Write a protein that binds this DNA or RNA. Structure first.
Ligand SMILES: [Mg+2]
Length: 299
DNA sequence: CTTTCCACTTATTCAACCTTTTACCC
DNA sequence: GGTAAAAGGTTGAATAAGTGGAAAGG
C-alpha cells in the first residue's frame, strides 16, 4: 500500500469532513508490563463503510500520516496514533479549526498530547491527569477505571461557518441528496420533490440554525425514535435548491460516493428546471436515476 | 517497557427512505 | 384545480465508539 495513490483534498474540506465524521481516542489500558501498571494510546480516527474508502485515502494523502485498515468486513478505518504524527493533526486543526461540539474533543486531545509530550503518562501523576481528561471524552471512564482512579472529575461550543469549503466537507458526511416521490393527485399521479438535508445530533442546534442564514434558505426539523432524538436542516423549496444549494456544491466539490449522488440529483434538477418531471418520459428517467442513487448505487 | 499497528466488536446516530397533509399557483 | 412545499413520520446500517492481542525495538 502507498500513502498517496489518491489525490489530496482541500484542508477546509478535510476539516468539514472531520467535523461531520470521526472521533479522538485516548486509551488507558491496565498493563502488567508498564512501570505504572497502565499504558496509553492517543489519536484520531474515522470508520466508514467500504464504499467511502477513497475518502480515507484522500485524508491520508493530505496529511501523510495515519493507517488505513479493514474494520470488520463492512467497513474500513483511518487511525492516527503514532505520537509524533499527531503534531500534523494538531498543526492541521490549529490552522483549519473544527466548529462543532467536536472542537471540545479536540481540546481534550491536545491537553492529553501535552501530558504525553512531556512523558508524564509514564508516572502515576500523569496517568491520573489523563484519567481526568478521558473522563470527559466520548464515553468517559469504564467502571473499572473509576475504581482505580475514583478522583473527582471536572460548556457548549458556539462557532460560525468559516466558508463553503468547510461546508462541502461537512455535507460530504452528514448531507443527503434525495429524490422524494410523492403519490399525488396530479396528472401523472406522482410528484417529484428534491430534498436536501443535513442530519445532526441535538447539541449542534446553533450550528444547524445558522445554516439557514448561511445558505439563505431551509428549515430545522426535530425528529425522534422513542428514546433518541436528532435534528435535520432541510430544504424543499425547488428554487432554493436550484439557485442556492446546487451552485454551492458545483463550486465546492463534494468528496466520496456522495459526489456521484450529488451529480445524479442535479440531473433531476435540470429535468425539473425544464418542467420535464411533469411528463411521463421525464418522470421515468427520474425514477431510473433515483433507483440507482444512494442506497441503490452500485458504482 | 512502550509504542504502534492489526483484528474485530456493538449499538445508536445518522442518512435515507416513505406517506399525508397543507400551501399556494393558476 | 393542479402542482409545490412542508409536516410528519419510519428504517437499518454506517458511524461512534470501543476492546484484546501482540510485534518490535527501547
Ligand atoms: Mg456523523
Amino acid at each position: 500500500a502507498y500513502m498517496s495513490r489518491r489525490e489530496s483534498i482541500n484542508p477546509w474540506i478535510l476539516t468539514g469532513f472531520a467535523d461531520a465524521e470521526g472521533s479522538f481516542l485516548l486509551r488507558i489500558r491496565n498493563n502488567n508490563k508498564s512501570s505504572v501498571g497502565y499504558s496509553t494510546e492517543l489519536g484520531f480516527q474515522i470508520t466508514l463503510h467500504n464504499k467511502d474508502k477513497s475518502i480515507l485515502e484522500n485524508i491520508q494523502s493530505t496529511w501523510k500520516v495515519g493507517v488505513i485498515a479493514n474494520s470488520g468486513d463492512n467497513a474500513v478505518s483511518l487511525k492516527v496514533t503514532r505520537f509524533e504524527d499527531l503534531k500534523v493533526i494538531i498543526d492541521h486543526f490549529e490552522k483549519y479549526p473544527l466548529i462543532t461540539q467536536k472542537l471540545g474533543d479536540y481540546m481534550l486531545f491536545k491537553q492529553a498530547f501535552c501530558v504525553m509530550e512531556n512523558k508524564e503518562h509514564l508516572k502515576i501523576n500523569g496517568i491520573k491527569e489523563l484519567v481526568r481528561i478521558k473522563a470527559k471524552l466520548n464515553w468517559g471512564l469504564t467502571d473499572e477505571l473509576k475504581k482505580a482512579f475514583p478522583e473527582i472529575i471536572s460548556s457548549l461550543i458556539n462557532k460560525n461557518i468559516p466558508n463553503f469549503k468547510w461546508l462541502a466537507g461537512f455535507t460530504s458526511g452528514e448531507g443527503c441528496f434525495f429524490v422524494n416521490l410523492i403519490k399525488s393527485k396530479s396528472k401523472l399521479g406522482v410528484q417529484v420533490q428534491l430534498v436536501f438535508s443535513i442530519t445532526q445530533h441535538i447539541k449542534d442546534k446553533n450550528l444547524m440554525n445558522s445554516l439557514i442564514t448561511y445558505l439563505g434558505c431551509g428549515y430545522i426539523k426535530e425528529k425522534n425514535k422513542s428514546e433518541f432524538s436528532w435534528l435535520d436542516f432541510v430544504v424543499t423549496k425547488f428554487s432554493d435548491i436550484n439557485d442556492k444549494i446546487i451552485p454551492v456544491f458545483q463550486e465546492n466539490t463534494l468528496i466520496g460516493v456522495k459526489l456521484e449522488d450529488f451529480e445524479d440529483w442535479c440531473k433531476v434538477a435540470k429535468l425539473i428546471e425544464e418542467k420535464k418531471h411533469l411528463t411521463e418520459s421525464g418522470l421515468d428517467e427520474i425514477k431510473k436515476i433515483k433507483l440507482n442513487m444512494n442506497k441503490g448505487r452500485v458504482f
